[PDB]
Amino acid sequence: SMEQVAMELRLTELTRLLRSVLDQLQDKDPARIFAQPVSLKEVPDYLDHIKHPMDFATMRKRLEAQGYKNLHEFEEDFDLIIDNCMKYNARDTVFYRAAVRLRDQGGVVLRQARREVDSIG
Numbered sequence: 001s002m003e004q005v006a007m008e009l010r011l012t013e014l015t016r017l018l019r020s021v022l023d024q025l026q027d028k029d030p031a032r033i034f035a036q037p038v039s040l041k042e043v044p045d046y047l048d049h050i051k052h053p054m055d056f057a058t059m060r061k062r063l064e065a066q067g068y069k070n071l072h073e074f075e076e077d078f079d080l081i082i083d084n085c086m087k088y089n090a091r092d093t094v095f096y097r098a099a100v101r102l103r104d105q106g107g108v109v110l111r112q113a114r115r116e117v118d119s120i121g
């Protein structure tokens with residue numbers, strides 16, 4: 001039905017939009033600390049602390065499957081990247097502090113993206 005196509009076409013240009021939002025977000029992680037999942041070989045205990053594990057590659061894989069139905073589902077996985085690292089690392093570490101930064105630089109990017117999702121529709 002034409003309604004399916006109108007939804008498919010809406011999903012598409014949400015995912016085009018989010019690709020730009022993901023590329024921008026990731027460019028605030030130039031050290032690339034969040035760009036690949038934390039390894040359960042290198043960190044065998046991660047899962048007795050961290051319940052929903054996440055990184056930018058995983059966000060990328062899901063995205064190209066057009067797996068984010070709204071901006072809020074995208075925001076939800078980003079906050080996991082951030083929130084998992086803060087939880088598992090002490091405040092004085094490079095890791096935790098990168099997580100605080102990525103959140104702050106990131107909020108600018110997610111500000112405009114809300115304005116571009118509602119202006120486009």
Ligand code: NA
Nearest residue numbers: 086087088089
């Ligand atoms: Na902690």
